[PDB]
Amino acid sequence: MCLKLNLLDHVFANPFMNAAGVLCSTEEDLRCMTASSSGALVSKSCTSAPRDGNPEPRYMAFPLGSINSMGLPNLGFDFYLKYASDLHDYSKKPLFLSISGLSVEENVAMVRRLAPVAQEKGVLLELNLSCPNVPGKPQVAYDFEAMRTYLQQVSLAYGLPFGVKMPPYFDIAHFDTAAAVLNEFPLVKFVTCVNSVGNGLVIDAESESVVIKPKQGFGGLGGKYILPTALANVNAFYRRCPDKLVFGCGGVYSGEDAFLHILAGASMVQVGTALQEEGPGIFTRLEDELLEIMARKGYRTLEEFRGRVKTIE
Amino acid sequence: MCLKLNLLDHVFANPFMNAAGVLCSTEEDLRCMTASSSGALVSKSCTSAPRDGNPEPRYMAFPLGSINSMGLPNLGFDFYLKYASDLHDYSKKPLFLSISGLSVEENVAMVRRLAPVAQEKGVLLELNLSCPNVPGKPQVAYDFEAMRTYLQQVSLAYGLPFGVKMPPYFDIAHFDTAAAVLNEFPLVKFVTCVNSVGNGLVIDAESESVVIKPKQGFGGLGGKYILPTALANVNAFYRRCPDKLVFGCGGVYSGEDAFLHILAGASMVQVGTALQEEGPGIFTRLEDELLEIMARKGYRTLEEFRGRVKTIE
Ligand SMILES: Cc1cc2nc3c(=O)[nH]c(=O)nc-3n(C[C@H](O)[C@H](O)[C@H](O)COP(=O)(O)O)c2cc1C
């Protein structure tokens, strides 16, 4: 009985990894994620220039999840590139580097530079589409013509297999259109579903106040609030993108949540809010929990049940 | 101390009502909602002709909320019109009727007939903008040109104050666009935020199966999962629609939850999943709990704190 997986020409001890933005911003964070029992890690989504992010408080968590408007605080691309080229120990586990440029040109400039390092060291790109573009326009993955533009230009500039981080969708016509766009791009080999559920609003009853400072309290939702949304997106893309891998992300706090993701079609399983709250110890628990469910069901590997969620009739 | 309020030229004993679809499909349901302590009731969204809806199981609830793909089962418009016209006791509480035609034409034909009953009896219209498919087209409220058309035609055909039931949005640009459309229509006097969060997917770990039969298990989410989404949408529209009321819907299980909706800007507060689960007794508890929070804070009226959620700096 086994959590091992081989994909994208890499070997992973188990399907677990951090979600981008969690425990991955500094060299200390990345070392800590590397020392954990996760199967992989991903760096914080980066921009060409270092960024302070939004004013604090900008993240808060509660029994059912989290809200954040971090504003892409990060040490800049040069730092994550150097971590990938010189500091990361690939004998420990694979590394994804997440990029989140504020325009298509900024993305192109980073990918062009990442390419030789990806070719030589095997760092894997995750391009964050659930990201701001021109203000007053929707985020890139909610604007299918911008999304197409970004993927064309990044495919050209990068020329190597990569994946994409997708916001959740809520409408079948959107699942359909989005997957069709992704399916135009053979180099997109994995699709990560989902980013935070956008612009929720948490209000503290005692203080009668929003709980984060940026954007009048509006921010992305993670955690228990979003598991069914996350599972729906995983399975929607799993079903529509048969030549691509899907990575699941949203609401994983237990091996059972991981099991559901995987049933939905997830290959890798990312952990955000629950990891921010519990710390990297969470990975041994998730592994032990998932292996317990497998034992009880008689499953020996992840492929025996990945994507095998049953429907009724 | 009492929770009485006046709006749209009607008096309401308190701000609570059912959410469209819940406990409101049959004469029996409507009579039950009338006998409750609710402040108002709304009928099941109707079509011109009766519908059986989707195959069962089509609704399921869990500790954090519910999923449904009912498929608009209803008795048909003639029945709700007759209820509004001959059966409802307006001395007990106001009635809203929800209409959800599958095209603009169907909507126009229903509202023309409702208009004289609205004039004569005071039944209020809630137009459901939240319907989905025809593979390749988004639900009307996610297609702003269709939405504008529906509201143009309905305002022309109906000619009296009405309200609209909105799905959640997730992106600030969409809030700005959606609100700007709604503000083109002076007869749109209330906006109900929000409908179920679209196309989530609940999977049972034990059976490895989805839990509702229609649409491969995909369906709209209600309950605790959606409270912060619902709060954001209420507040976003309350900010953007200063000449309209906003009615809150989503994740109300307690007086506290209702308090947060009203802080966010809600005038009326609709109860869906929690009402389905607990039954109509829920209304006495919610009134008590909301009055209790008020007394503790020294608030005498809903007006004193409606829309007064605090932001940070
Ligand atoms: C504090 C915080 C920072 C995040 N930053 C990023 C980021 O830089 N890039 C990204 O693609 N997603 C980011 N996310 C989204 C997470 O990667 C994940 O998609 C989301 O939190 C849902 O997973 P969860 O429910 O396990 O939290 C962040 C989330 C949190 C809570």
Ligand SMILES: Cc1cc2nc3c(=O)[nH]c(=O)nc-3n(C[C@H](O)[C@H](O)[C@H](O)COP(=O)(O)O)c2cc1C
């Ligand atoms: C069984 C069921 C049926 C519903 N039917 C309708 C409907 O006919 N029209 C409508 O506008 N909303 C309908 N909804 C959505 C609710 O009115 C409400 O917007 C949603 O459930 C979110 O509120 P809640 O969190 O309190 O469940 C229905 C919800 C459920 C759970």
Ligand SMILES: COc1ccc2cc(CCc3c(C(=O)O)[nH]c(=O)[nH]c3=O)ccc2c1
């Ligand atoms: C209001 O100023 C803002 C707010 C949010 C922003 C979000 C991003 C994308 C990075 C990201 C973040 C983040 O860094 O805030 N949080 C998430 O939940 N998912 C993400 O993909 C990037 C820039 C952002 C700028």
Ligand SMILES: COc1ccc2cc(CCc3c(C(=O)O)[nH]c(=O)[nH]c3=O)ccc2c1
């Ligand atoms: C054929 O499959 C479907 C599935 C869902 C449909 C939903 C509507 C709108 C009625 C409605 C329903 C419903 O009746 O399923 N449920 C909600 O949560 N909100 C709604 O507004 C209308 C038609 C629907 C048809």
